Amino acid sequence: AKIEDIVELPIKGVRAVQSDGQIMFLSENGRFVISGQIYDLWSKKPLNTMSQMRDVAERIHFKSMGMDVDTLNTVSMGRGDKEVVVFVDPRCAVCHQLMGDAKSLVDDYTFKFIVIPALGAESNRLAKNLYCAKDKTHALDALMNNTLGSLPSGQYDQTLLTAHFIGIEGVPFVVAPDGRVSKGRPKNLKSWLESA
Amino acid sequence: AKIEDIVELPIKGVRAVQSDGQIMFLSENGRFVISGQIYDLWSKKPLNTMSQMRDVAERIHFKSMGMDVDTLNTVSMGRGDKEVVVFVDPRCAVCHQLMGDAKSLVDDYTFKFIVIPALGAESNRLAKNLYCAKDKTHALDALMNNTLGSLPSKETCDPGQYDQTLLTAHFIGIEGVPFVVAPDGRVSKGRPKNLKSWLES
Numbered sequence: 056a057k058i059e060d061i062v063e064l065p066i067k068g069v070r071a072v073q074s075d076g077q078i079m080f081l082s083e084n085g086r087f088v089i090s091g092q093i094y095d096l097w098s099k100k101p102l103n104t105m106s107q108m109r110d111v112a113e114r115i116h117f118k119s120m121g122m123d124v125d126t127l128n129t130v131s132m133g134r135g136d137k138e139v140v141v142f143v144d145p146r147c148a149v150c151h152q153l154m155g156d157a158k159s160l161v162d163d164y165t166f167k168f169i170v171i172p173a174l175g176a177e178s179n180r181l182a183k184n185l186y187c188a189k190d191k192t193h194a195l196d197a198l199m200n201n202t203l204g205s206l207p208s209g210q211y212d213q214t215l216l217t218a219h220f221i222g223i224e225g226v227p228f229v230v231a232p233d234g235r236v237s238k239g240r241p242k243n244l245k246s247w248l249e250s251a
Numbered sequence: 252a253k254i255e256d257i258v259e260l261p262i263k264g265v266r267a268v269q270s271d272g273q274i275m276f277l278s279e280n281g282r283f284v285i286s287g288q289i290y291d292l293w294s295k296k297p298l299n300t301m302s303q304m305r306d307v308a309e310r311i312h313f314k315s316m317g318m319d320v321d322t323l324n325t326v327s328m329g330r331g332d333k334e335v336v337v338f339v340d341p342r343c344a345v346c347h348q349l350m351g352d353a354k355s356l357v358d359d360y361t362f363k364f365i366v367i368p369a370l371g372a373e374s375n376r377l378a379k380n381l382y383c384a385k386d387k388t389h390a391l392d393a394l395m396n397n398t399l400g401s402l403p404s405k406e407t408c409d410p411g412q413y414d415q416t417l418l419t420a421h422f423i424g425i426e427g428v429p430f431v432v433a434p435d436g437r438v439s440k441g442r443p444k445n446l447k448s449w450l451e452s
Contacts, residue, residue, distance in 0.1 A: 060269040062304035064276070064289075065424050067263060073256040080285055082265075084422065089276060091287015093260075108258040111283075220280055222261055 071108040114234030128214040133161035140230040145181035150227040267304040310436030324416040329357035336432035341377035346429040367417040383408030
């Protein structure tokens, strides 16, 4: 069954508002109100409570959205049964520092470092090399030391394109085991992973 | 009663999409769909057809939305019974051209030149001078020839560093200058290639 007609509306943000039991959707500047029901098509679920609303604003649940992060330009570090996802650029020094902090935590977490060239054509180069690594154990090591170009083996990186599509902004971008997101490096990684 | 809770959603755009007769609202990356009814609070009307969706995407109806342009930093040119609205910057030469072209149309239209300082501090200064001017009779001419700075000012005017006419334009979706609104509401983001005809249809 088809979409027959499409019109872009002058709407740049939407807020869910709850009053006396009913949840409505207001455009960010107060021009439009939509009375009805919102559905998360990627998670294939209706959002019916303010708690579910907050979940999609504050959290990312990759497997729930049909995303396997191991299929991206991803390298893994650690042994924990709690998964931590960190989008990183190969030239990002705060990303490198964050990755250094994660080394002390490898017993309780498994880190998924997803390499994205968010910072340019040279970042593309390094990310592109890592993608073609013979041995991703060394790739991991290469990533953390900023030694990626001398790695044994498109201008438009798929991991970059995907992150952008789904709204990942800036690096580093961290997703805790419970889905909580950190736009940037948290003050204390260990504490942040434990709880809000 | 009270609004008990509020959540900003990860949505940057909404498309009205029509499927099997009903209209739904889809987020920019397709992640979210909202089934239901949209109401336009500025013009106070429900929107139920794809034609009404196109109307709010393509047109601005100042009076329907309760917007009186004469309350803004505005200057009129022409005598005609069809109102044409043009947002301009004082330093915008492309805007001055359009104004010249408009001299020839004063028979059919009245032009409402809405002055906004969108291009920086010198633009701010000139718009503020127009606003605080003792004498608005020559105001049109000063605008078109870019001589607003020599307009004698009222004692002791100061409206503040943030121009309300600019704030209004930004709020209701004016983008760039010049920005033209035809009598029937159609918008032109930039000077149309051919004006008189554009104003026609």
